Each structure stands twice: as structure tokens, then as C-alpha cells.
mmCIF file of C-alpha atoms and ligand atoms in Angstrom:
data_model
loop_
_atom_site.group_PDB
_atom_site.id
_atom_site.type_symbol
_atom_site.label_atom_id
_atom_site.label_comp_id
_atom_site.label_asym_id
_atom_site.label_seq_id
_atom_site.Cartn_x
_atom_site.Cartn_y
_atom_site.Cartn_z
ATOM 1 C CA UNK A 1 -27.027 32.900 -13.342
ATOM 2 C CA UNK A 2 -24.905 29.416 -12.529
ATOM 3 C CA UNK A 3 -26.580 27.964 -15.707
ATOM 4 C CA UNK A 4 -23.163 26.487 -16.719
ATOM 5 C CA UNK A 5 -22.044 25.128 -13.361
ATOM 6 C CA UNK A 6 -21.770 21.249 -12.518
ATOM 7 C CA UNK A 7 -23.319 19.785 -9.305
ATOM 8 C CA UNK A 8 -20.694 18.390 -7.026
ATOM 9 C CA UNK A 9 -21.868 14.536 -7.294
ATOM 10 C CA UNK A 10 -18.965 12.071 -6.795
ATOM 11 C CA UNK A 11 -17.542 10.963 -10.146
ATOM 12 C CA UNK A 12 -18.366 7.298 -9.171
ATOM 13 C CA UNK A 13 -21.992 8.123 -8.719
ATOM 14 C CA UNK A 14 -22.147 9.981 -12.146
ATOM 15 C CA UNK A 15 -20.325 6.560 -13.614
ATOM 16 C CA UNK A 16 -22.921 4.383 -11.684
ATOM 17 C CA UNK A 17 -25.817 6.554 -12.995
ATOM 18 C CA UNK A 18 -24.581 6.156 -16.511
ATOM 19 C CA UNK A 19 -24.740 2.256 -16.149
ATOM 20 C CA UNK A 20 -28.297 2.687 -14.808
ATOM 21 C CA UNK A 21 -29.145 5.069 -17.910
ATOM 22 C CA UNK A 22 -32.957 5.737 -16.528
ATOM 23 C CA UNK A 23 -34.607 7.832 -13.759
ATOM 24 C CA UNK A 24 -38.155 7.261 -12.615
ATOM 25 C CA UNK A 25 -39.680 10.287 -10.733
ATOM 26 C CA UNK A 26 -42.955 10.316 -8.871
ATOM 27 C CA UNK A 27 -43.533 13.866 -8.258
ATOM 28 C CA UNK A 28 -46.341 16.188 -7.518
ATOM 29 C CA UNK A 29 -44.545 19.238 -9.211
ATOM 30 C CA UNK A 30 -46.877 20.128 -12.231
ATOM 31 C CA UNK A 31 -44.636 19.017 -15.329
ATOM 32 C CA UNK A 32 -45.473 22.628 -16.780
ATOM 33 C CA UNK A 33 -43.168 23.893 -13.929
ATOM 34 C CA UNK A 34 -40.884 20.881 -13.693
ATOM 35 C CA UNK A 35 -40.165 20.691 -17.431
ATOM 36 C CA UNK A 36 -37.143 23.120 -17.517
ATOM 37 C CA UNK A 37 -35.503 21.333 -14.535
ATOM 38 C CA UNK A 38 -35.685 18.036 -16.439
ATOM 39 C CA UNK A 39 -34.439 19.441 -19.892
ATOM 40 C CA UNK A 40 -31.404 21.242 -17.997
ATOM 41 C CA UNK A 41 -30.686 17.890 -16.087
ATOM 42 C CA UNK A 42 -30.643 15.996 -19.444
ATOM 43 C CA UNK A 43 -28.214 18.637 -20.800
ATOM 44 C CA UNK A 44 -25.670 17.789 -17.930
ATOM 45 C CA UNK A 45 -26.559 13.973 -18.229
ATOM 46 C CA UNK A 46 -27.598 13.148 -21.550
ATOM 47 C CA UNK A 47 -27.195 9.457 -20.892
ATOM 48 C CA UNK A 48 -30.158 9.418 -18.449
ATOM 49 C CA UNK A 49 -33.779 8.834 -19.871
ATOM 50 C CA UNK A 50 -36.288 10.479 -17.547
ATOM 51 C CA UNK A 51 -39.704 9.240 -16.850
ATOM 52 C CA UNK A 52 -41.761 11.897 -14.927
ATOM 53 C CA UNK A 53 -44.867 10.815 -13.314
ATOM 54 C CA UNK A 54 -46.783 14.037 -12.563
ATOM 55 C CA UNK A 55 -49.171 12.533 -9.730
ATOM 56 C CA UNK A 56 -51.434 13.817 -6.898
ATOM 57 C CA UNK A 57 -49.685 13.903 -3.393
ATOM 58 C CA UNK A 58 -52.000 11.218 -1.865
ATOM 59 C CA UNK A 59 -51.679 9.156 -4.859
ATOM 60 C CA UNK A 60 -47.850 9.308 -4.944
ATOM 61 C CA UNK A 61 -47.994 7.782 -1.331
ATOM 62 C CA UNK A 62 -50.562 5.183 -1.900
ATOM 63 C CA UNK A 63 -48.816 4.105 -5.184
ATOM 64 C CA UNK A 64 -45.315 3.844 -3.691
ATOM 65 C CA UNK A 65 -46.389 2.045 -0.566
ATOM 66 C CA UNK A 66 -48.400 -0.517 -2.476
ATOM 67 C CA UNK A 67 -45.849 -1.067 -5.223
ATOM 68 C CA UNK A 68 -43.104 -1.375 -2.323
ATOM 69 C CA UNK A 69 -45.359 -3.901 -0.406
ATOM 70 C CA UNK A 70 -45.896 -6.001 -3.554
ATOM 71 C CA UNK A 71 -42.145 -5.942 -4.369
ATOM 72 C CA UNK A 72 -42.966 -4.414 -7.542
ATOM 73 C CA UNK A 73 -41.066 -1.830 -9.792
ATOM 74 C CA UNK A 74 -41.364 1.610 -8.159
ATOM 75 C CA UNK A 75 -40.084 5.112 -8.389
ATOM 76 C CA UNK A 76 -36.260 6.023 -8.045
ATOM 77 C CA UNK A 77 -37.011 9.397 -6.568
ATOM 78 C CA UNK A 78 -40.031 10.914 -4.752
ATOM 79 C CA UNK A 79 -40.598 14.549 -4.870
ATOM 80 C CA UNK A 80 -44.018 15.965 -3.299
ATOM 81 C CA UNK A 81 -45.361 19.086 -1.712
ATOM 82 C CA UNK A 82 -47.282 16.912 0.923
ATOM 83 C CA UNK A 83 -44.434 17.289 3.509
ATOM 84 C CA UNK A 84 -46.039 15.155 6.226
ATOM 85 C CA UNK A 85 -46.376 12.245 3.687
ATOM 86 C CA UNK A 86 -42.783 12.715 2.515
ATOM 87 C CA UNK A 87 -41.515 12.861 6.040
ATOM 88 C CA UNK A 88 -43.585 9.873 7.126
ATOM 89 C CA UNK A 89 -42.126 7.661 4.242
ATOM 90 C CA UNK A 90 -38.498 8.883 4.702
ATOM 91 C CA UNK A 91 -38.864 8.116 8.602
ATOM 92 C CA UNK A 92 -40.320 4.613 8.106
ATOM 93 C CA UNK A 93 -37.731 2.672 6.003
ATOM 94 C CA UNK A 94 -38.307 3.779 2.543
ATOM 95 C CA UNK A 95 -35.645 6.242 1.896
ATOM 96 C CA UNK A 96 -32.033 5.531 0.774
ATOM 97 C CA UNK A 97 -29.648 7.257 3.136
ATOM 98 C CA UNK A 98 -27.403 9.775 1.077
ATOM 99 C CA UNK A 99 -25.450 12.764 2.100
ATOM 100 C CA UNK A 100 -25.762 15.307 -0.717
ATOM 101 C CA UNK A 101 -22.625 17.145 -1.459
ATOM 102 C CA UNK A 102 -25.002 20.005 -2.624
ATOM 103 C CA UNK A 103 -26.665 20.309 0.831
ATOM 104 C CA UNK A 104 -23.650 20.985 3.081
ATOM 105 C CA UNK A 105 -25.187 24.488 4.057
ATOM 106 C CA UNK A 106 -28.772 23.117 4.368
ATOM 107 C CA UNK A 107 -30.074 24.080 7.889
ATOM 108 C CA UNK A 108 -30.962 20.901 10.019
ATOM 109 C CA UNK A 109 -34.686 21.958 9.803
ATOM 110 C CA UNK A 110 -34.498 21.517 6.005
ATOM 111 C CA UNK A 111 -33.334 17.949 5.956
ATOM 112 C CA UNK A 112 -34.098 14.770 7.726
ATOM 113 C CA UNK A 113 -30.415 14.103 8.369
ATOM 114 C CA UNK A 114 -29.433 12.281 5.313
ATOM 115 C CA UNK A 115 -32.854 10.774 4.415
ATOM 116 C CA UNK A 116 -34.699 13.542 2.612
ATOM 117 C CA UNK A 117 -34.225 17.149 1.737
ATOM 118 C CA UNK A 118 -35.911 20.416 1.236
ATOM 119 C CA UNK A 119 -35.887 21.544 -2.427
ATOM 120 C CA UNK A 120 -38.042 24.838 -2.448
ATOM 121 C CA UNK A 121 -39.291 27.460 -0.303
ATOM 122 C CA UNK A 122 -42.768 28.002 -1.753
ATOM 123 C CA UNK A 123 -45.282 30.541 -0.452
ATOM 124 C CA UNK A 124 -49.216 30.131 -0.215
ATOM 125 C CA UNK A 125 -50.530 33.134 -1.945
ATOM 126 C CA UNK A 126 -53.648 34.516 -3.173
ATOM 127 C CA UNK A 127 -54.394 34.781 -6.837
ATOM 128 C CA UNK A 128 -57.252 36.667 -8.352
ATOM 129 C CA UNK A 129 -58.724 37.706 -11.807
ATOM 130 C CA UNK A 130 -57.903 41.357 -12.439
ATOM 131 C CA UNK A 131 -61.112 41.608 -14.614
ATOM 132 C CA UNK A 132 -63.149 41.120 -11.627
ATOM 133 C CA UNK A 133 -61.043 42.374 -8.618
ATOM 134 C CA UNK A 134 -58.535 45.373 -9.214
ATOM 135 C CA UNK A 135 -55.169 44.851 -7.359
ATOM 136 C CA UNK A 136 -56.119 47.714 -4.890
ATOM 137 C CA UNK A 137 -59.274 45.986 -3.847
ATOM 138 C CA UNK A 138 -57.380 42.601 -2.909
ATOM 139 C CA UNK A 139 -56.583 42.469 0.797
ATOM 140 C CA UNK A 140 -53.210 41.197 1.920
ATOM 141 C CA UNK A 141 -54.325 40.172 5.384
ATOM 142 C CA UNK A 142 -56.626 37.119 6.663
ATOM 143 C CA UNK A 143 -58.896 39.622 8.331
ATOM 144 C CA UNK A 144 -59.090 41.957 5.233
ATOM 145 C CA UNK A 145 -60.012 39.028 2.997
ATOM 146 C CA UNK A 146 -62.699 38.002 5.646
ATOM 147 C CA UNK A 147 -64.061 41.444 5.087
ATOM 148 C CA UNK A 148 -64.074 41.142 1.459
ATOM 149 C CA UNK A 149 -65.616 37.840 1.531
ATOM 150 C CA UNK A 150 -68.887 39.480 3.336
ATOM 151 C CA UNK A 151 -69.661 41.182 0.045
ATOM 152 C CA UNK A 152 -72.468 39.937 -1.970
ATOM 153 C CA UNK A 153 -70.313 40.023 -5.139
ATOM 154 C CA UNK A 154 -67.946 37.487 -3.600
ATOM 155 C CA UNK A 155 -70.503 34.678 -3.009
ATOM 156 C CA UNK A 156 -69.561 31.719 -5.078
ATOM 157 C CA UNK A 157 -66.533 33.547 -6.234
ATOM 158 C CA UNK A 158 -63.916 32.053 -3.864
ATOM 159 C CA UNK A 159 -61.589 28.863 -4.201
ATOM 160 C CA UNK A 160 -59.566 27.256 -1.723
ATOM 161 C CA UNK A 161 -57.969 23.747 -1.009
ATOM 162 C CA UNK A 162 -59.975 20.713 0.055
ATOM 163 C CA UNK A 163 -57.759 19.507 3.041
ATOM 164 C CA UNK A 164 -59.933 16.360 2.877
ATOM 165 C CA UNK A 165 -58.893 15.297 -0.856
ATOM 166 C CA UNK A 166 -55.307 16.972 -1.088
ATOM 167 C CA UNK A 167 -52.758 15.894 1.233
ATOM 168 C CA UNK A 168 -50.806 19.291 0.553
ATOM 169 C CA UNK A 169 -54.001 21.263 0.883
ATOM 170 C CA UNK A 170 -53.960 19.726 4.525
ATOM 171 C CA UNK A 171 -50.317 20.651 4.962
ATOM 172 C CA UNK A 172 -51.061 24.341 4.012
ATOM 173 C CA UNK A 173 -54.364 24.935 5.545
ATOM 174 C CA UNK A 174 -53.175 22.892 8.941
ATOM 175 C CA UNK A 175 -50.073 25.191 9.045
ATOM 176 C CA UNK A 176 -52.215 28.283 8.535
ATOM 177 C CA UNK A 177 -54.878 27.215 11.161
ATOM 178 C CA UNK A 178 -51.848 26.381 13.693
ATOM 179 C CA UNK A 179 -49.819 29.675 13.298
ATOM 180 C CA UNK A 180 -52.452 32.397 12.533
ATOM 181 C CA UNK A 181 -55.467 33.044 14.733
ATOM 182 C CA UNK A 182 -56.956 35.185 12.117
ATOM 183 C CA UNK A 183 -57.296 31.998 9.847
ATOM 184 C CA UNK A 184 -60.380 31.026 12.015
ATOM 185 C CA UNK A 185 -62.279 34.347 10.953
ATOM 186 C CA UNK A 186 -61.214 33.625 7.296
ATOM 187 C CA UNK A 187 -62.521 30.091 7.299
ATOM 188 C CA UNK A 188 -65.885 31.409 8.496
ATOM 189 C CA UNK A 189 -65.822 33.950 5.644
ATOM 190 C CA UNK A 190 -65.055 31.016 3.403
ATOM 191 C CA UNK A 191 -68.523 29.664 4.574
ATOM 192 C CA UNK A 192 -70.159 33.019 4.245
ATOM 193 C CA UNK A 193 -68.787 33.288 0.500
ATOM 194 C CA UNK A 194 -69.774 29.646 -0.191
ATOM 195 C CA UNK A 195 -66.012 28.946 -1.180
ATOM 196 C CA UNK A 196 -65.615 25.870 -3.665
ATOM 197 C CA UNK A 197 -62.799 23.439 -2.428
ATOM 198 C CA UNK A 198 -60.379 21.968 -4.925
ATOM 199 C CA UNK A 199 -57.884 19.187 -4.918
ATOM 200 C CA UNK A 200 -55.359 20.769 -7.255
ATOM 201 C CA UNK A 201 -53.997 24.203 -8.023
ATOM 202 C CA UNK A 202 -54.928 23.774 -11.815
ATOM 203 C CA UNK A 203 -58.487 23.093 -11.019
ATOM 204 C CA UNK A 204 -58.829 26.301 -8.848
ATOM 205 C CA UNK A 205 -56.667 28.339 -11.289
ATOM 206 C CA UNK A 206 -58.916 27.260 -14.381
ATOM 207 C CA UNK A 207 -61.936 28.756 -12.227
ATOM 208 C CA UNK A 208 -60.170 31.926 -11.646
ATOM 209 C CA UNK A 209 -58.916 32.252 -15.183
ATOM 210 C CA UNK A 210 -62.622 31.817 -16.521
ATOM 211 C CA UNK A 211 -64.124 34.036 -13.835
ATOM 212 C CA UNK A 212 -66.362 31.340 -12.324
ATOM 213 C CA UNK A 213 -64.356 32.441 -9.386
ATOM 214 C CA UNK A 214 -62.545 35.870 -8.700
ATOM 215 C CA UNK A 215 -59.959 34.691 -6.060
ATOM 216 C CA UNK A 216 -58.177 31.558 -4.803
ATOM 217 C CA UNK A 217 -56.557 31.330 -1.381
ATOM 218 C CA UNK A 218 -53.477 29.135 -0.570
ATOM 219 C CA UNK A 219 -52.198 27.753 -3.813
ATOM 220 C CA UNK A 220 -48.435 27.744 -4.787
ATOM 221 C CA UNK A 221 -46.861 31.138 -5.687
ATOM 222 C CA UNK A 222 -44.670 29.198 -8.003
ATOM 223 C CA UNK A 223 -47.573 28.097 -10.242
ATOM 224 C CA UNK A 224 -49.072 31.507 -10.117
ATOM 225 C CA UNK A 225 -45.916 33.067 -11.466
ATOM 226 C CA UNK A 226 -45.675 30.578 -14.394
ATOM 227 C CA UNK A 227 -49.428 31.044 -15.191
ATOM 228 C CA UNK A 228 -49.195 34.886 -15.278
ATOM 229 C CA UNK A 229 -46.549 34.549 -18.141
ATOM 230 C CA UNK A 230 -49.435 33.403 -20.503
ATOM 231 C CA UNK A 231 -52.398 34.762 -18.567
ATOM 232 C CA UNK A 232 -52.035 38.594 -18.111
ATOM 233 C CA UNK A 233 -55.477 38.649 -16.134
ATOM 234 C CA UNK A 234 -53.921 36.659 -13.140
ATOM 235 C CA UNK A 235 -52.853 38.766 -10.089
ATOM 236 C CA UNK A 236 -50.870 37.574 -7.240
ATOM 237 C CA UNK A 237 -51.191 39.058 -3.593
ATOM 238 C CA UNK A 238 -48.800 38.093 -0.832
ATOM 239 C CA UNK A 239 -50.128 37.811 2.683
ATOM 240 C CA UNK A 240 -48.322 40.602 4.869
ATOM 241 C CA UNK A 241 -49.856 39.295 8.173
ATOM 242 C CA UNK A 242 -47.986 35.960 7.642
ATOM 243 C CA UNK A 243 -47.289 33.760 4.686
ATOM 244 C CA UNK A 244 -47.095 29.785 5.118
ATOM 245 C CA UNK A 245 -44.057 28.478 2.994
ATOM 246 C CA UNK A 246 -43.976 24.737 2.099
ATOM 247 C CA UNK A 247 -40.718 22.922 1.164
ATOM 248 C CA UNK A 248 -41.182 20.349 -1.452
ATOM 249 C CA UNK A 249 -39.446 17.211 0.016
ATOM 250 C CA UNK A 250 -37.295 14.886 -2.148
ATOM 251 C CA UNK A 251 -35.982 11.621 -1.119
ATOM 252 C CA UNK A 252 -34.448 8.512 -2.841
ATOM 253 C CA UNK A 253 -36.227 5.167 -2.902
ATOM 254 C CA UNK A 254 -34.256 2.746 -0.643
ATOM 255 C CA UNK A 255 -35.404 -0.093 -3.159
ATOM 256 C CA UNK A 256 -34.647 2.319 -6.396
ATOM 257 C CA UNK A 257 -33.674 0.369 -9.387
ATOM 258 C CA UNK A 258 -31.527 3.430 -10.279
ATOM 259 C CA UNK A 259 -30.301 4.901 -7.162
ATOM 260 C CA UNK A 260 -27.334 6.766 -8.649
ATOM 261 C CA UNK A 261 -29.491 8.526 -11.194
ATOM 262 C CA UNK A 262 -31.707 9.392 -8.414
ATOM 263 C CA UNK A 263 -28.643 10.753 -6.503
ATOM 264 C CA UNK A 264 -27.766 12.831 -9.452
ATOM 265 C CA UNK A 265 -31.238 14.347 -9.716
ATOM 266 C CA UNK A 266 -31.237 15.165 -6.027
ATOM 267 C CA UNK A 267 -27.756 16.794 -6.177
ATOM 268 C CA UNK A 268 -29.005 18.684 -9.237
ATOM 269 C CA UNK A 269 -32.197 19.999 -7.520
ATOM 270 C CA UNK A 270 -30.083 21.249 -4.512
ATOM 271 C CA UNK A 271 -27.240 22.618 -6.490
ATOM 272 C CA UNK A 272 -26.637 26.194 -7.257
ATOM 273 C CA UNK A 273 -27.434 25.402 -10.883
ATOM 274 C CA UNK A 274 -30.823 23.717 -10.136
ATOM 275 C CA UNK A 275 -31.796 26.375 -7.580
ATOM 276 C CA UNK A 276 -30.991 29.127 -10.018
ATOM 277 C CA UNK A 277 -32.990 27.506 -12.796
ATOM 278 C CA UNK A 278 -35.942 27.148 -10.424
ATOM 279 C CA UNK A 279 -35.773 30.897 -9.549
ATOM 280 C CA UNK A 280 -35.111 32.206 -13.096
ATOM 281 C CA UNK A 281 -36.718 29.930 -15.577
ATOM 282 C CA UNK A 282 -38.980 27.186 -13.856
ATOM 283 C CA UNK A 283 -40.391 30.211 -11.562
ATOM 284 C CA UNK A 284 -40.359 27.666 -8.696
ATOM 285 C CA UNK A 285 -39.429 29.644 -5.447
ATOM 286 C CA UNK A 286 -36.051 28.383 -4.636
ATOM 287 C CA UNK A 287 -34.647 27.060 -1.367
ATOM 288 C CA UNK A 288 -31.387 28.628 -1.626
ATOM 289 C CA UNK A 289 -30.782 32.308 -0.906
ATOM 290 C CA UNK A 290 -27.845 32.651 -3.508
ATOM 291 C CA UNK A 291 -30.310 32.666 -6.554
ATOM 292 C CA UNK A 292 -31.154 35.428 -9.185
ATOM 293 C CA UNK A 293 -34.662 35.479 -10.721
ATOM 294 C CA UNK A 294 -38.418 36.153 -9.850
ATOM 295 C CA UNK A 295 -38.800 33.180 -7.695
ATOM 296 C CA UNK A 296 -36.423 33.802 -4.798
ATOM 297 C CA UNK A 297 -36.408 33.752 -0.941
ATOM 298 C CA UNK A 298 -35.451 37.510 -1.263
ATOM 299 C CA UNK A 299 -38.395 38.342 -3.539
ATOM 300 C CA UNK A 300 -40.797 36.488 -1.211
ATOM 301 C CA UNK A 301 -39.273 38.316 1.937
ATOM 302 C CA UNK A 302 -39.668 41.717 0.261
ATOM 303 C CA UNK A 303 -43.344 40.772 -1.067
ATOM 304 C CA UNK A 304 -44.570 39.821 2.476
ATOM 305 C CA UNK A 305 -42.510 42.675 4.374
ATOM 306 C CA UNK A 306 -39.731 40.595 5.949
ATOM 307 C CA UNK A 307 -38.315 37.144 6.444
ATOM 308 C CA UNK A 308 -39.869 37.096 9.963
ATOM 309 C CA UNK A 309 -43.302 37.188 8.281
ATOM 310 C CA UNK A 310 -42.683 33.767 6.493
ATOM 311 C CA UNK A 311 -43.582 30.481 8.567
ATOM 312 C CA UNK A 312 -41.358 27.836 6.679
ATOM 313 C CA UNK A 313 -42.880 24.346 7.696
ATOM 314 C CA UNK A 314 -39.808 22.355 8.626
ATOM 315 C CA UNK A 315 -38.657 18.989 7.006
ATOM 316 C CA UNK A 316 -38.662 17.494 10.474
ATOM 317 C CA UNK A 317 -40.245 14.382 12.185
ATOM 318 C CA UNK A 318 -41.972 16.847 14.426
ATOM 319 C CA UNK A 319 -44.472 17.819 11.638
ATOM 320 C CA UNK A 320 -46.072 14.079 11.857
ATOM 321 C CA UNK A 321 -47.919 15.762 14.815
ATOM 322 C CA UNK A 322 -50.195 16.820 11.988
ATOM 323 C CA UNK A 323 -51.072 13.215 11.118
ATOM 324 C CA UNK A 324 -52.150 12.285 14.673
ATOM 325 C CA UNK A 325 -55.744 11.451 14.673
ATOM 326 C CA UNK A 326 -56.703 13.828 17.362
ATOM 327 C CA UNK A 327 -54.758 16.775 15.941
ATOM 328 C CA UNK A 328 -56.292 16.046 12.529
ATOM 329 C CA UNK A 329 -59.769 15.701 14.103
ATOM 330 C CA UNK A 330 -59.452 19.167 15.885
ATOM 331 C CA UNK A 331 -58.553 20.972 12.510
ATOM 332 C CA UNK A 332 -60.986 18.993 10.247
ATOM 333 C CA UNK A 333 -63.832 19.567 12.858
ATOM 334 C CA UNK A 334 -63.178 23.357 12.952
ATOM 335 C CA UNK A 335 -62.680 23.480 9.179
ATOM 336 C CA UNK A 336 -65.805 21.518 8.112
ATOM 337 C CA UNK A 337 -68.021 23.607 10.460
ATOM 338 C CA UNK A 338 -66.496 26.974 9.302
ATOM 339 C CA UNK A 339 -66.621 26.280 5.424
ATOM 340 C CA UNK A 340 -70.173 25.061 5.392
HETATM 341 CL CL1 CL B 1 -28.846 24.259 11.285
HETATM 342 CL CL1 CL B 2 -60.767 19.572 -7.471
HETATM 343 CL CL1 CL B 3 -24.208 24.104 -9.329
HETATM 344 CL CL1 CL B 4 -27.246 29.448 -1.292
HETATM 345 MG MG1 MG B 5 -49.319 19.051 -8.912
#
């Protein structure tokens, strides 16, 4: 649905983007998942060449800060799941202020005024290998997963984030810790099962697919849906006690060489066309409710047993509390003691 519509970017912005002719993206969205968006954007605007830099969340931050400080060529658009890092940059002078004509109905907690925008509503899910755990054996609660991880067969068979090496692994597990008391019991059960910690979804998924691990906790439902299309052994379980949802944050570099191309791409991501392509084809869980496909808010809400079971991390300067050293210290001390 909406596959032929045109985002409402101002015609002067389209003409300015044509004069630029190029768009440099730094993104943590795996290119496997991003590629259909890039292809569809080029169908709309064939006069823009896209350079897609598929990078780690901490690496995007470090590279962009370093390049900016050097006065050097950097990204036009930054698109990352490490919400706190994106909100920090966009609240420190790095962002081009732009009021997207596609974001008029965004809630105030899904945008930083005109500086940065939510593009997705992506759940942290459980993935497992059906050869080793049947669907009916996989709990959908933190307390139930804690019980499963007492079992001898689960020792060495669990993957989760390393929040000390992945910035979004921090986002997700910090939010879980903050919102769900049962997270503490589950983290001790990660210690019991000798959970292996990964800095990327692909590294954890490769282990689940090989059966080195049976179950991975906290990775993106978007990537799981897309992997399941080619790996029929991959199962997905949604948490019914409460689901953390991240919002991938996009903003335009204030110092972009191609700011208008970046405007068009932001407006594309936020548009009904882009959000429908997420939900239907890319299998990225869309931010917009008015979407058709597998990767939709309605589908997430049905899977978890209602919208009130989803904690959507806001695109807000309030989330920078998570970067406070004492707040980071409390979480990481708890984590490191529980998972050892
Ligand atoms: Cl609002
Ligand atoms: Cl890793
Ligand atoms: Cl549209
Ligand atoms: Cl909508
Ligand atoms: Mg990635």
C-alpha cells in the first residue's frame, strides 16, 4: 500500500537536492534491511547517488564527531538505533533544523522539535532455533525465561547484547532494567546459563542459526523477520510481560555537503510511502500506524497483548539521563555482577 505516493518535500528542496546529486548516509540499519528503502528512494529521485555506510552505533558517533572537529567531509544524514547518542548529537549543535512536512502528526515525544525524528518503532524480541527449542517451550516473560535458563541444556546456549560494546545494546538493556523489575532475575539467569554477549544482531543470529546458541534476547524484531524469510528454523517470541521498543533516530548534519538530498531522504523515511515500504518489504517495524505489512505497530501490539505492554523509548533530551555517569554506573555494576 502507498507504493506510488510522493513525499510532500517542497519543490525547491527537490530542485536543490538535484543540484547536489549525492547523499552520504551513516547508518546502523543493516544494509540487508535498508536496501529496499534505498532502491525505492532512487526510483523517486533517480538523480541522487546514495553512499550507504553501514556502521556500528558507537562508530557512527565517534567518526561523525571526529570528522566534524577536523572540518572534514562527513555524512549528510545520520540514522542510528543508539537513541541516546543520536539525541546527544542533535541537542549539541550537530543537527540541521528542518521541519519535515511528513512529520506533522508525529507525537512530540517522537521528535526533538525540528532537530531529529523517530523513523521506526522496533521491538526487542527473543529469537530462537526451532531445531533446539520448540515454539511451545519458549517463554514470553522475563520470569519464564529466567526459569528456562536454569535448565542444564541452556548452559552456553544463550546470546544477548554486550551493553559495554554496543551503544544500542546499552539503550535496550538500560530501558529493560529501568522499566521491568523481572529484568534483574533474568540478568542473574544470564549468569547461570553463561550467556555470551554480542555487539551486533548479526553476530548473535549467526550463533542461533548454527545452534551454538539456541536463544538470543533483546535483538531487533525487524532483523528477525527479514532473517526468517531465508532461515525457516528461526523463531520469534514477543515478550507479553512488557516489550522495549526503540525508535531509530534520523537527523541531518548541520554541516552536510548535500543538506537538501538529506531532507528528501528524511521526508521519504517519514512518509506513508517509506513507512509502508518498511512495514511490507524491508520488514522494519514502522513508526506510522497507517501501514500494511508484517512489521507494523498493530502487529507488534497484537503479538505482545496490547499497546499498553510496549514501552517506546522517547526521542527526548530526557533519555540523556542514561549517559549520566552515576546512572550508567548503577546499571553496569548490576549487569556485570549478574551476568558473570
Ligand atoms: Cl504530542
Ligand atoms: Cl560481537
Ligand atoms: Cl507518501
Ligand atoms: Cl500514520
Ligand atoms: Mg547494524
